[PDB]
Tab-separated table of C-alpha atoms in Angstrom:
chain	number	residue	atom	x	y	z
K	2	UNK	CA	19.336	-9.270	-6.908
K	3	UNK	CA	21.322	-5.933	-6.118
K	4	UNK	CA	19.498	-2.898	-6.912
K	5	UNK	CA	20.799	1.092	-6.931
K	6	UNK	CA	20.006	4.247	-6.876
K	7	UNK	CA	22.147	7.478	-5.626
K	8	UNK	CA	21.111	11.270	-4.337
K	9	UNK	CA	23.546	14.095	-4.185
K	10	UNK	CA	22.905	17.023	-1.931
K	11	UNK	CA	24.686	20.146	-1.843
K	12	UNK	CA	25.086	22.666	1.164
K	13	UNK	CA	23.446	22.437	4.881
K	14	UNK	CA	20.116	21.805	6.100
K	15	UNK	CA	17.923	24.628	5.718
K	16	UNK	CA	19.581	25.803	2.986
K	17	UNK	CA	20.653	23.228	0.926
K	18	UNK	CA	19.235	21.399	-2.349
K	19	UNK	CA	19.360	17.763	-3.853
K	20	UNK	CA	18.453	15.555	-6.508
K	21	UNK	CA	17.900	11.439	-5.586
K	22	UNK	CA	18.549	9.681	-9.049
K	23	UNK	CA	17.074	6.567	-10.851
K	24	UNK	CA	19.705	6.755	-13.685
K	25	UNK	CA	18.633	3.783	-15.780
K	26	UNK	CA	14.887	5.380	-15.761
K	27	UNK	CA	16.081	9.010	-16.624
K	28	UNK	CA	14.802	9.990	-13.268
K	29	UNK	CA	15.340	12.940	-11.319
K	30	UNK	CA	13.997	13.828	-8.558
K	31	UNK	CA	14.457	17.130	-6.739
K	32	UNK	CA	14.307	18.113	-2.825
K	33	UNK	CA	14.812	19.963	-0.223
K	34	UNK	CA	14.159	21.208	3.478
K	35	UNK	CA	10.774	22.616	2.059
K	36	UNK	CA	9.942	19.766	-0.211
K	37	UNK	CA	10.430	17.269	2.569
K	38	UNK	CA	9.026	18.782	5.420
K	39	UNK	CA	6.921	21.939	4.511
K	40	UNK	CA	4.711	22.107	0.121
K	41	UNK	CA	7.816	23.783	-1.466
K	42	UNK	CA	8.033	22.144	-4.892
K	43	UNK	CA	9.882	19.197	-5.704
K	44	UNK	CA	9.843	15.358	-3.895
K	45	UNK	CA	10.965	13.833	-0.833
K	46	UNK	CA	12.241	10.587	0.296
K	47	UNK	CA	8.898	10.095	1.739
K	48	UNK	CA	6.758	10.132	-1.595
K	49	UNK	CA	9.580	7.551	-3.409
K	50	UNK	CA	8.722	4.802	0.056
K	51	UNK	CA	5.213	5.692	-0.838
K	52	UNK	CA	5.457	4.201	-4.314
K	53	UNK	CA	7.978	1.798	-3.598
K	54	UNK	CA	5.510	-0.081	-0.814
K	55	UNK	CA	2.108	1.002	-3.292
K	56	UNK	CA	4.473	-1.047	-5.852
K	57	UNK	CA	5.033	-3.715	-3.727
K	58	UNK	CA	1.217	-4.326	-2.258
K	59	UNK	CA	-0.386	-4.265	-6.112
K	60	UNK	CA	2.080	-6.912	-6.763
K	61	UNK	CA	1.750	-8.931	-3.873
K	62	UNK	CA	-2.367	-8.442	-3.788
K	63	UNK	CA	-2.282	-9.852	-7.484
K	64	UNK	CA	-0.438	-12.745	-6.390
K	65	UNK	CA	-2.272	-13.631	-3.578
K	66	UNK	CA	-5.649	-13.741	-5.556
K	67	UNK	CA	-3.959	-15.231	-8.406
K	68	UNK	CA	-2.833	-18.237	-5.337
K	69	UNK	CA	-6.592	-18.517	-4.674
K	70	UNK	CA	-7.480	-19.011	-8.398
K	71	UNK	CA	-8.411	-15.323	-9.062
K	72	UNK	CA	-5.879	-13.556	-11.096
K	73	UNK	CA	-6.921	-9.477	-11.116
K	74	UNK	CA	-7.985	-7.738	-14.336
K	75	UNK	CA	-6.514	-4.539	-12.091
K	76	UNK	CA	-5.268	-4.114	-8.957
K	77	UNK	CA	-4.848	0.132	-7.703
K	78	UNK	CA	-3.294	1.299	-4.826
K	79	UNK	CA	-2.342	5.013	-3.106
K	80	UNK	CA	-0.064	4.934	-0.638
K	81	UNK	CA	0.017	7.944	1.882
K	82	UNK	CA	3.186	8.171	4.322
K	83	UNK	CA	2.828	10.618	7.095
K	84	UNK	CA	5.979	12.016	8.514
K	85	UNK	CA	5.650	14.162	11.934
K	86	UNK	CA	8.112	16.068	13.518
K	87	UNK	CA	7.909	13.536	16.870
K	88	UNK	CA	9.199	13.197	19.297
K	89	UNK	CA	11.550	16.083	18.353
K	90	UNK	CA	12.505	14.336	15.864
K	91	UNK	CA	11.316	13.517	12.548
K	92	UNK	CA	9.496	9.935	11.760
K	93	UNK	CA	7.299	8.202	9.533
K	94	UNK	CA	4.571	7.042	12.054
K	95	UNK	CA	1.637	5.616	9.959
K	96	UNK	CA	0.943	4.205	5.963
K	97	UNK	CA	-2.047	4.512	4.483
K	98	UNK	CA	-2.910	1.838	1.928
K	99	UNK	CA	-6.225	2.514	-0.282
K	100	UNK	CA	-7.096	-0.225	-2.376
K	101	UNK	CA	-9.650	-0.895	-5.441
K	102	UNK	CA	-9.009	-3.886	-7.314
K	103	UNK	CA	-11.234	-5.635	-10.241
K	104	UNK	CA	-11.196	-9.261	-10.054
K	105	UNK	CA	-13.116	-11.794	-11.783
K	106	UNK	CA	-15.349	-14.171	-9.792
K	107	UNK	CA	-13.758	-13.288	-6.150
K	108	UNK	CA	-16.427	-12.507	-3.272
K	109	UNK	CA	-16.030	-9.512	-1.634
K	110	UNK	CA	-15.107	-11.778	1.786
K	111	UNK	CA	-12.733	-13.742	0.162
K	112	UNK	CA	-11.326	-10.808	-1.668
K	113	UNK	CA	-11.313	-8.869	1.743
K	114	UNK	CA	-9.246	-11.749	3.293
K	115	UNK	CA	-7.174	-11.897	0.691
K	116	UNK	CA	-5.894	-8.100	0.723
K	117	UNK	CA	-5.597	-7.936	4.859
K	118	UNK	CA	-3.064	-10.970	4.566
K	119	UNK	CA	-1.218	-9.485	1.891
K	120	UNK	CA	-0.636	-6.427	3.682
K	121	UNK	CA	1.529	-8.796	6.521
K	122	UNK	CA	3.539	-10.375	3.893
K	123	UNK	CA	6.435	-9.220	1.553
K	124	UNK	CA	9.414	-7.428	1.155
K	125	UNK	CA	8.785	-3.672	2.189
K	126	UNK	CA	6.239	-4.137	4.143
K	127	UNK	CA	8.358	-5.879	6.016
K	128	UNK	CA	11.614	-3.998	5.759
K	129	UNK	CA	9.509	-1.035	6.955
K	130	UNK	CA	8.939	-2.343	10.684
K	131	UNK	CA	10.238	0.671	12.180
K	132	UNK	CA	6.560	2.116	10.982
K	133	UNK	CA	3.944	2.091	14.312
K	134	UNK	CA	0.802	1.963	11.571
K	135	UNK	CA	-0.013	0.604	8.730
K	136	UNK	CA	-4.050	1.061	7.791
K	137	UNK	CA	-5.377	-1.289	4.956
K	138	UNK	CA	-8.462	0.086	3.115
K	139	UNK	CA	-9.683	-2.167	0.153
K	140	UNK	CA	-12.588	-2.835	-2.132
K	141	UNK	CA	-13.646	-4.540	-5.390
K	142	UNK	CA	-14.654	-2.215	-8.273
I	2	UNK	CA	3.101	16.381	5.659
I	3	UNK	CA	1.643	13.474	4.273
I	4	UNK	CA	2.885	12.261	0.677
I	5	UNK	CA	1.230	9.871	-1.624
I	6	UNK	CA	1.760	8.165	-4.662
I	7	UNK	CA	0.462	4.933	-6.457
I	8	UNK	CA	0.886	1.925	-8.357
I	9	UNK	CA	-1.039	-0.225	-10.791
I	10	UNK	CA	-0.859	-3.834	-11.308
I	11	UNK	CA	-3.020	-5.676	-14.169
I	12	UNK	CA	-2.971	-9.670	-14.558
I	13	UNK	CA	-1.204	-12.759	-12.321
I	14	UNK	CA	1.980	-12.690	-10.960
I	15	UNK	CA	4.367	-13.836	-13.750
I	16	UNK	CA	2.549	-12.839	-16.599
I	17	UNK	CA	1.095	-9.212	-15.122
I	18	UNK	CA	3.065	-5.954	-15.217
I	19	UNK	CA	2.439	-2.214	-13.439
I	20	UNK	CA	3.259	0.845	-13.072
I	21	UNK	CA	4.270	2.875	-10.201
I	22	UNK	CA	3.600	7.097	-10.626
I	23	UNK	CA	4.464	10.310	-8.799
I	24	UNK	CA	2.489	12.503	-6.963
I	25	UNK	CA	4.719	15.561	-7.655
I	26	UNK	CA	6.265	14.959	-10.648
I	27	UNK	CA	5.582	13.465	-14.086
I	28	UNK	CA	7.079	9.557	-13.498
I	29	UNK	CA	5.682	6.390	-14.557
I	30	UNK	CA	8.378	3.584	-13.363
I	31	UNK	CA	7.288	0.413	-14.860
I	32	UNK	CA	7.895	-2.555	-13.447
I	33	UNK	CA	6.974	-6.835	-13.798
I	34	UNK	CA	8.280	-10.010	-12.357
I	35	UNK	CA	11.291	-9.880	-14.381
I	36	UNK	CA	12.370	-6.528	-13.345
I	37	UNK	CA	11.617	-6.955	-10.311
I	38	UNK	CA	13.345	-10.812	-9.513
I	39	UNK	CA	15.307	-11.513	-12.570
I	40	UNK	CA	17.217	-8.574	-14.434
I	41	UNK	CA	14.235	-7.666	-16.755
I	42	UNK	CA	13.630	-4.353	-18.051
I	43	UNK	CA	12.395	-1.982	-15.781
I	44	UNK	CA	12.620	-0.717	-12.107
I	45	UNK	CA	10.760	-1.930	-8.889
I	46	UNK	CA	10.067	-0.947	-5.638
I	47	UNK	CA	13.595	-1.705	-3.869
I	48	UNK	CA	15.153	1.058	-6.429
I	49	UNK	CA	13.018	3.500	-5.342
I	50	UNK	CA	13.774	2.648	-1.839
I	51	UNK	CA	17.308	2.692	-2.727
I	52	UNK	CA	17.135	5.832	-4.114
I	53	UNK	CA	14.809	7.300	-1.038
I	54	UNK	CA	17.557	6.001	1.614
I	55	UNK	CA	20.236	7.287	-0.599
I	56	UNK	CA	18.458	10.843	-0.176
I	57	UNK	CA	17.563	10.546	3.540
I	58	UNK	CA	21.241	10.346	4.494
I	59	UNK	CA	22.729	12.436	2.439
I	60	UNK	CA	20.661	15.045	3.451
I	61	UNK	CA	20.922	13.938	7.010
I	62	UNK	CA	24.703	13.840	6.885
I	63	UNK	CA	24.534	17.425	5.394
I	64	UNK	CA	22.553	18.390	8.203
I	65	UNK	CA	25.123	17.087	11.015
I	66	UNK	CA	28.349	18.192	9.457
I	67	UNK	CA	26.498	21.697	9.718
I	68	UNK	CA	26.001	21.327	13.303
I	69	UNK	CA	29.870	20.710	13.447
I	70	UNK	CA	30.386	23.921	11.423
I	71	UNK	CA	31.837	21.884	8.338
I	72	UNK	CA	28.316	22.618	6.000
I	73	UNK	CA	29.177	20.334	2.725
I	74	UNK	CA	29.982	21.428	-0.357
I	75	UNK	CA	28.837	18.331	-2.253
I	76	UNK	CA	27.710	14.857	-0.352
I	77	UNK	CA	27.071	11.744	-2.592
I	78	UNK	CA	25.344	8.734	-1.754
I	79	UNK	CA	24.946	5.431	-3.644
I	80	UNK	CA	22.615	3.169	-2.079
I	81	UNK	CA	22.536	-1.079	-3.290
I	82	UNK	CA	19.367	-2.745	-2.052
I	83	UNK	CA	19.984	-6.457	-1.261
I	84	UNK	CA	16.773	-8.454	-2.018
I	85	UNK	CA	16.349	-12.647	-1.903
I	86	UNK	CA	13.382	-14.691	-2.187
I	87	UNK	CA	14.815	-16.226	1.118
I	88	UNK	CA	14.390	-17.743	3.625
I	89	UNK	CA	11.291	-19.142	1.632
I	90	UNK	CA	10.148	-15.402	1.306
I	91	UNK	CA	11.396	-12.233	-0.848
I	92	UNK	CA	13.306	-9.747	2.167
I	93	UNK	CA	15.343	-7.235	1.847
I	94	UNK	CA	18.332	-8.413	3.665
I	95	UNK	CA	21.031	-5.921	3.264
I	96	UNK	CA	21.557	-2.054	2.325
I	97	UNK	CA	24.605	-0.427	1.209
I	98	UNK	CA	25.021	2.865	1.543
I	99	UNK	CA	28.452	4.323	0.009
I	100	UNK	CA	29.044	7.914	0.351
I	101	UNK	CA	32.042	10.382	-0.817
I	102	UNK	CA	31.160	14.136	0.362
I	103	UNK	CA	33.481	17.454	-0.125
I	104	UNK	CA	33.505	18.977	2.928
I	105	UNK	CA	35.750	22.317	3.653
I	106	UNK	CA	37.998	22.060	6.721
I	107	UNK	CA	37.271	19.132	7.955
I	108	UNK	CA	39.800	16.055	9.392
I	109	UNK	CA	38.881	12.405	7.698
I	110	UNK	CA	38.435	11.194	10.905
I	111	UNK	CA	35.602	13.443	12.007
I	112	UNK	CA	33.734	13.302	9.029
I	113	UNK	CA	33.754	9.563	9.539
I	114	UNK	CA	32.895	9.701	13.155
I	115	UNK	CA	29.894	12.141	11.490
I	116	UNK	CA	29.162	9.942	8.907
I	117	UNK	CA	28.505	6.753	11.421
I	118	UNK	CA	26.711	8.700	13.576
I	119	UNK	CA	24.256	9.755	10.747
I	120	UNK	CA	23.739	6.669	9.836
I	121	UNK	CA	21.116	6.100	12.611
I	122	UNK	CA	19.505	8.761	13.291
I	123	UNK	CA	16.672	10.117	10.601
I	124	UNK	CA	13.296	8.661	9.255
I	125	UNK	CA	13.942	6.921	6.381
I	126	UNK	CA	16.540	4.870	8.023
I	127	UNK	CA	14.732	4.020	11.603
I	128	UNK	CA	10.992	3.515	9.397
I	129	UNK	CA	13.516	0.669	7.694
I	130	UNK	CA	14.274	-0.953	11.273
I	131	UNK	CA	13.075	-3.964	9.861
I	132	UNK	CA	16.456	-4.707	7.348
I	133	UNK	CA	18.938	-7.089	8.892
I	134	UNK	CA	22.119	-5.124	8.254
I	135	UNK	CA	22.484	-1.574	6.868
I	136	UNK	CA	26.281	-0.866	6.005
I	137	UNK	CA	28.239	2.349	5.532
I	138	UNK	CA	31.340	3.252	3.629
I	139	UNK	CA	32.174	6.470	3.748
I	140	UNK	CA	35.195	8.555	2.328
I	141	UNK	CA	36.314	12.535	2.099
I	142	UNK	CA	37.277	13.618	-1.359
């Protein structure tokens, strides 16, 4: 499938404002220079990858237990993307993922195998190569 | 900075649905196999990456026409994700990004000299190193 989304920004750099749009969901989502790289109020690129890949493991964790004959009751993860100003230029360098899933029957080995394979496996984990770290935390609850 | 946001999953794989939320704003995007890899109501994590590329380079290309001393009036970005469950596996092979800017005083042929250029160089777009082919088109209105 083909998916889309569009952002307008208006102005320069420093100075300038814009909106990234998820038009279908009735989504906007403001930023700017100190939204993305400083706390001014609104979003950032950087917190939409965040969800996207958080999306992406809870899926692919449920999956991958479901495979092994363990389908979750819930699977919860943050995602934390750190963006550094290095090496004069601006890059995301590590993901955090922080995991607490509650499944049925699963050991906590098992389980713990489980979630450190699905972290090597689909879509935007994948796409996001160009990332140096990616740190897996995870436990049943 | 580091930003965060998360995403729930309940249930298997086909039958399960979640929910990915903001940090810094008020959005719950669900999402389910359907959404996701049929056309099923609903958004999914290559929209918001989509709409997180589409914001990167717009501000990016904002920021380099400035350095040129052509600052834009308006730059617009639509970004299409390309996702297949191929080659065996769900990847996200291709990204479109299609861009029409107002930009005072500028020639077309420098903006789209600007434009390529930009297409490189910023986070969002060198974190997604791992997507086969990432395609611009680009036009002055």
């Amino acid at each position: 499938p083909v998916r889309k989304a569009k952002a307008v920004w208006e102005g320069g750099l420093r100075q300038g404002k814009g909106v990234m749009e998820l038009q279908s969901q009735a989504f906007q989502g403001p930023y700017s220079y100190p939204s993305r790289f400083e706390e001014g109020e609104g979003t950032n690129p950087e917190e939409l990858i965040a969800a996207a890949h958080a999306g992406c493991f809870s899926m692919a964790l449920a999956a991958s237990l479901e495979r092994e004959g363990f389908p979750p009751k819930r699977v919860s993860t943050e995602a934390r993307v750190h963006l550094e100003v290095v090496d004069g230029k601006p890059t995301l360098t590590r993901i955090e993922l922080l995991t607490e899933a509650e499944v049925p029957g699963i050991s906590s080995e098992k389980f713990l195998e489980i979630a450190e394979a699905a972290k090597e496996g689909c879509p935007v984990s994948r796409a996001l190569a160009g990332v140096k770290e990616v740190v897996l935390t995870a436990r049943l609850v």
